[PDB]
Design a protein around this ligand. Structure first.
Ligand SMILES: COc1cc2nccc(Oc3ccc4c(C(=O)NC5CC5)cccc4c3)c2cc1OC
Length: 289
């Protein structure tokens, strides 16, 4: 809230928005002239319900200022404008990501997956591959490195909070706002949220990605015994689409001591190298077959 609000730069006229169908509250809409292109654009709008508690108002208002303060980054949902002046409801507008959350998307591609491609490639039009999985991981790491470098803590980093746009570009959203499955031990037992606890979560996210949309800790009940084992040191087993290195990155993220966990910067470099390693390998697979 301390943060300022430049209406000149962000305010957008309400009658320039055509509110469409709901998505989640979040609504799909068309905005005319929302950006320089002065064209029509599909956008996602988060708005307050009729007569919302003045608490929900500043809540959504701070959501808008967080976005304005954080700034722009390709891997973080982009703020396009807002309706804050009197005359209608408060609305925060962001770019639209047509494919939705990464989790649901990955689940829908389980029958359309191959670790890598070889000619004839049309046998794999729009197929998910290891490069895709590692690439999504890389992008989210960069987004997190971006948020972290700004003292911003996600608090709920999971696949459902990752959105997918055109050309396999993923974006982080709903930051700084059961979920026990993504919470680090210290967050559960001490209620402590740090950048390092977001790393633990990144670990669960990795698992989601390499399980192609699976729910973490399958078959396990989330009770006292579950939390205890998390403390004892017990960890999920490798997911079905993981590579050896990736599962170790998960384990690293799930280190008991927060300080011993990798930083998002380290993770960006690591996943970056994995991505290249995979590409080289793929070039060979592709060249000899
Ligand atoms: C096709 O399905 C969807 C596509 C979507 N594409 C883009 C954005 C969507 O919802 C969102 C997600 C996060 C925010 C935040 C925000 O992240 N605020 C925190 C930054 C403080 C602030 C303001 C509006 C938002 C709209 C979408 C929702 C969908 O359905 C659920």
């Amino acid at each position: 809230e301390r943060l300022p609000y430049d209406a000149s730069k962000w305010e957008f006229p309400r009658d320039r928005l055509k509110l469409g169908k709901p998505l989640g509250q979040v609504i799909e809409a068309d905005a005319f002239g929302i950006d320089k292109t002065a064209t029509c654009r599909t956008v996602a709008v988060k708005m307050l319900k009729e007569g919302a508690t003045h608490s929900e108002h500043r809540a959504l208002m701070s959501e808008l200022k967080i976005l304005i303060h954080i700034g722009h980054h390709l891997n973080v949902v982009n703020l396009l404008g807002a309706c804050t002046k009197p005359g209608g409801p408060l609305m925060v507008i962001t770019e639209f990501c047509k494919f939705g959350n990464l989790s649901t998307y990955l689940r829908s591609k389980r029958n359309e997956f191959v670790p890598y491609k070889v000619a004839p490639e049309d046998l794999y039009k729009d197929f998910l591959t290891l490069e895709h999985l590692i690439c999504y991981s890389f992008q989210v790491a960069k987004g997190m490195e971006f948020l972290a470098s700004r003292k911003c803590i996600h608090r709920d980093l999971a696949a459902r909070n990752i959105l997918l746009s055109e050309k396999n570009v993923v974006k982080i959203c709903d930051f700084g706002l059961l979920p026990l499955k993504w919470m680090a031990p210290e967050t559960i037992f001490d209620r402590v949220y740090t950048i390092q606890s977001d790393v633990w979560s990144f670990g669960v996210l990795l698992w989601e990605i390499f399980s192609l949309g699976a729910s973490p800790y399958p078959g396990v009940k989330i009770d006292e015994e579950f939390c205890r084992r998390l403390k004892e040191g017990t960890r999920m087993r490798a997911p079905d689409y993981t590579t050896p290195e990736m599962y170790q990155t998960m384990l690293d993220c799930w280190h008991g001591e927060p300080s011993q966990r990798p930083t998002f910067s380290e993770l960006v470099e690591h996943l970056g190298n994995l991505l290249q390693a995979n590409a080289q390998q793929d070039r060979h697979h592709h060249h000899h077959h």
